[model samples]
Target: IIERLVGNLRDLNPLDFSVDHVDLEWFETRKKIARFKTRQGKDIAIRLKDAPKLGLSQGDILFKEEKEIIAVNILDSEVIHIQAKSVAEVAKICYEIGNRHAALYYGESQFEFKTPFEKPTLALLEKLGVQNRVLSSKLDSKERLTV
Candidate 1:
């Protein structure tokens, strides 16, 4: 039953017979309650009842049918992609973005992160004059923190 799946919510095997899927964006995964459905067209609720927000993520199973599990898949999202041309550029950009508490994934040549579709951050990027473009993709699951 559903209770069985909830009991093992954190450690699910994708190899298990996946009977359905729930698609949600990263922000949607943060919600504590809502009504959603599985990929197989099954109505589902995200209520906590006595629990708090589950902090769901892509590949989380929400339903179990017989011996099958339904997993959550994070939908692609829009973001302002920045490709820094120089170390100085990377430093400034990383500093500003970090100051705003944005989640970022950094590599040798570039960095990627998720932010809502807005102009303020875009304007800042443009003002910095770094090579940038707007595109939608899955953000990095890991966030970098200077500690």
Candidate 2:
């Protein structure tokens, strides 16, 4: 059990340690306290000092030993992926998704976006005449919309 995270793996040499990961769903990353089991079968308890402002991201190190490390691994989830055809389309899509208070994320391309999959949301997009599809994707915290 750990009370706090050590550091992010992005800043360290992962090759120097034997890495283990705690798989978590997109929404679970926002939690301040939770219990999880690593892929290696190690039990972990996380209790952050404060609720994370933007929430945990992939590669966050939870524990570190001489030659071992435990890190966070965000699992893939179903999402409504959108590829806007123009700037105006992007604006309209963002407005509609934000209006519903749904979490939105940026995709690989500048005009691409993603939101957690919801039947009504998809139907709404269809009504708006935008290009979108359901896809299995990783909603990285780093790519979130901040306002």
Candidate 3:
């Protein structure tokens, strides 16, 4: 499944794509969660690669332009000094991250999950008329990982 998503993205022409920023809820402390009200917010989750015996490997997100790789712990997202990629690549990366014991979402930041298979639905894919629709939503206009 991860391979397929990668294939779907790598095959695309980066010139014709965009991704929508995702809304996330996070915590600054125990029992306290904050629903992000901003339009752009990406956080990185690094240490999670050492999470309890899940022994997950850190996945590298390749930034096409910079030719640099961002080492991200599974499920965590981050906005760093990196080149941007096409919507297809973004979706593929997020999908694979979600599949392999964790997830990588559209917004900036990582998330800790209780299980695998916390993936995007085929229905949402269909709604955008493509397998990858990060910003396939016509209503949203955010271009960067910011509010």
TM-score of each: 0.63, 0.87, 0.20
For all candidates, what are the clash counts? 0, 0, 15
lDDT of each: 0.61, 0.86, 0.27
Please give the ranking of all candidate structures by lDDT, highest first, separated by commas: 2, 1, 3
lDDT of candidate 2? Answer: 0.86
Shift in Å, residue 21, candidate 1: 1.2
**Model 3 lDDT, residue 100, Cα:** 42
Tens-place lDDT per residue, model 3, 4-122, is: 11112234345343322223212121112223222234433222222323222222221222422222122332211111246564555445444543322233322211111223343
lDDT of 1 by residue, 3-43 (tens): 21254345645465655678887567556568877778787
| Candidate 3 Cα lDDT to native | 0.27
Backbone clash pairs for candidate 1 read: none
> Which has the better lDDT: candidate 1, or candidate 2?
2
How does candidate 1 fare on TM-score?
Answer: 0.63
How do these models rank on TM-score, best leading? 2, 1, 3
Q: Candidate 3, which ten residues in sequence have the lowest lDDT sum?
A: 1-10
